Amino acid sequence: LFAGWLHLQPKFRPSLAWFKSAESRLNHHLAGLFGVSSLAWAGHLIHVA
Amino acid sequence: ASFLSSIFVPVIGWVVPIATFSFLFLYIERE
C-alpha cells in the first residue's frame, strides 16, 4: 500500500518506456518471481516443513 | 476477548453503511 503511493509521486513515477520493456520483465519474472520463489519454497520445505 | 464482536459487528452493520451512504449521497448530489 505504501509502494503504490510511492510510485505515483512525480520523480518516483515510472516513464512510458519502462512499461513497454517486455524482454526485461520476462527475464526478471521467470527467474525471480517464478524461479527464486520456487527455490525459496524448496528451502522452506527442507529446513522447516 | 470475545466481546469485541459486540462492538465491531454493530458498527459494520449499522454505523459503517450510515456513514458511507450519507457521504456518497451528498457527494453524488453535489454541483
Partner: peptide
C-alpha cells in the same frame, strides 16, 4: 486460543495499513 492481550496488538498494527489505504485511495483521485 490466543491471549486477550495479543488481540489488541493486532488491532493497533492494523491501523498502519488502514492509514496507508486511506492515503493510496485518495492519491488515486476523488
Amino acid at each position: 486460543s490466543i491471549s486477550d492481550t495479543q488481540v489488541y496488538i493486532a488491532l493497533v498494527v492494523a491501523l498502519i495499513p488502514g492509514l496507508l489505504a486511506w492515503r493510496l485511495a485518495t492519491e488515486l483521485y476523488k
